[model samples]
Target: ATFEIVNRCSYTVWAAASKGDAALDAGGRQLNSGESWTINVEPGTNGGKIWARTDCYFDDSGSGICKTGDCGGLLRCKRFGRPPTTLAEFSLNQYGKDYIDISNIKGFNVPMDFSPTTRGCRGVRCAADIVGQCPAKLKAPGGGCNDACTVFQTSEYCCTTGKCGPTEYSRFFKRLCPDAFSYVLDKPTTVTCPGSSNYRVTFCPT
Candidate 1:
């Protein structure tokens, strides 16, 4: 399936994709506002994720750090980037079905729309003013909302012991973007489509 990574924001964004330990797009690519890139996802690509990196400056060899979603200060990330990032997650060709979702569980930096381009499937979007509405304790320094688990690492927030429920912070995120996965146990937002579907991940979508 094809994944179209589009940037509709007014500023620059470095897009990155990860499938387990494999780095797609050589780990990351720079996308000036209004630019777009393509990624051909192979079949059975499970736990694949697409995300945006902001406030970054990389040299000629792709060596630099981003304020958000920085993967070890490398322009070409070798793995999943850091948090305070929104995500478009998918699992392709698993049992003839494709699963997709917009996730803010790691926190929200940019507004995103994960829509199917080929199949007539429903899309999930999270275009809320999350950064502005973020709680003071969970506010990230570089601009973005950090999840409670990331800020206060306890079983209550992290679900480390398999016993956790919605907290005030998770409810805050969920209240703004009901279509995104807000917490560890959030389940209603996951969408399923046919395996042959292609997708578009739009940043700062209007």
Candidate 2:
């Protein structure tokens, strides 16, 4: 299988995807506007997440942070980045189906499209100006929209109560990107595509 990383935003994007403890990166590159890169993965790749970093500052050694989606100041990220980052989360080739989604529950930095290159799977995308329309309290400093869990961190917003569901705050994101996963416990939004279909992740899909 493969993951095609694309950039269609107005600015350069530093993209990354991880599974287990590995990342695909210059250590990171300037995925400029109208550019894209494709990376192949194993047949049963699981527990992976793909995201783009924006407004990043890195020295010659790749030792810097990003305004959004900072991988703890590392070029080759072994873990997930901070919030205000749109994510394409997946667990593939398990029990015969592929579970995937565009997760706004973490927040939104760049709009994205996660879709199969061919048949045997359905595509999922979140293409919205969530940051531009962000509420006063839930806005990221540079750019991006903050989810309630990232901003407030309350059990109710994070759905830690076990019986928790969407709050008014979560609804803010859900309303715009209806197909996205808007909460921590969202199963209804994630799609289980059929098998072995390569997918594409476009940063600013048209």
Candidate 3:
């Protein structure tokens, strides 16, 4: 599977990927405005998650912390990033099909579009001004919006007991980006595509 990550934000973005068969593209890369990077993922990779980090500075040794989506402050992340970042999650060649979604369960920092290049697969986008419109309680540092789970850490938002439902905060996120997963129980937002499909994830997409 091929994943193309494009940066359209006015500022620079550090793209990151993780939780796959192998860390795709060494797990991260720097993307200046209008720049892009492509990743070739091995088939059967599951639970893959991709995101963009902002306001970051990395040393020549590939180590740094991003204001948003920082993964242990490592440029080549070996772990999942912190919350308050939009995510493009995917699974390829599972039961001979591909599944993907744009998720805000971790919260939102930048607008995004996740789509398949081939036909027969629908796209998902989250272009809302989540940062600007974030509620006071759900606001994070570095101009990002926090998810209820990350902010409160209770079962009401985190679903720790597996008996949770959407709350006001989740609704706020869903209202803006209906195509994204606002909470852990969000399922219908996942889109199905053909196996071997190539995908594009655009940051700050219009």
Candidate 4:
């Protein structure tokens, strides 16, 4: 679904939303200000809440009121219906802000993508030990490698003595597919392994 806010105030206004309750406490980035920006929400998840702060600027400290917009506060939009029945109007106060929580909705369009299946031996262990055991850890301190790391298929494996070296396939996978979860094929016809060779990478649609 989508939400639009008309900048009726003299100064510019900004909007933002948190993934969950924890995000609310952590704060979020500005969604839009001058005019509009559509947010593709997930489907069959009821509805979400969006917060608005007019004439507000974010700095090292946090979100603060600026010398603009109708009011110098925040507003929220909630309880909106699904895609078929989206928000009708989003109102902002002159000097105050509001919060709107949307719920009990249906037919919401969730944005998702089918990731490419990977297969091969990479620097990181495929499916055995923890992710950090490899020379160049695939995952961060606490993070775990995804199935893509385990099942990644690549002909370009690093060779040392006899066993294959850990190919940084994750970085290669990201470089090949940067948008969404799936790899995009139309842009480039081939994938190049830096300082190595070139191979055809097809981004099949799911």
Expressed as tens digits, the lDDT of each residue in 125-173 for candidate 2 is 8887788888889998867898999999899888887767887777888
List the global CA lDDT of all models: 0.90, 0.82, 0.90, 0.26
Query: How many steric clashes does model 1 contain?
Result: 0
Q: Output the worst ten-in-a-row residue range by lDDT, candidate 2.
A: 20-29
**How well does candidate 2 score on lDDT at residue 28?**
44
The TM-scores, one per candidate, come to 0.97, 0.93, 0.97, 0.25
Candidate 2 total steric clashes: 0
Q: Is candidate 2 or candidate 3 better by TM-score?
A: 3
Winner on TM-score between 1 and 4 is 1
Ranking by TM-score: 1, 3, 2, 4
lDDT string, candidate 3, 1-206, tens digits: 88899999999999999983346767999999999899887888889989999889889999878999999999977688888989999989999899999889999998999999888789999999989999999999666999999999898899898888888999999999999999988657999999989999999889
> Given candidate 3, what's the lDDT at residue 85?
87
Model 3 clash pairs?
none
lDDT of 4 by residue, 1-206 (tens): 23332332233434443343222222223433234344433322222333333334555655354221212223322222112111111112213321222210111111111111232211110111322332242332222222222233333321223344323442333333332111111122221112211111111111
Q: What is the lDDT of residue 179 in candidate 1?
A: 93
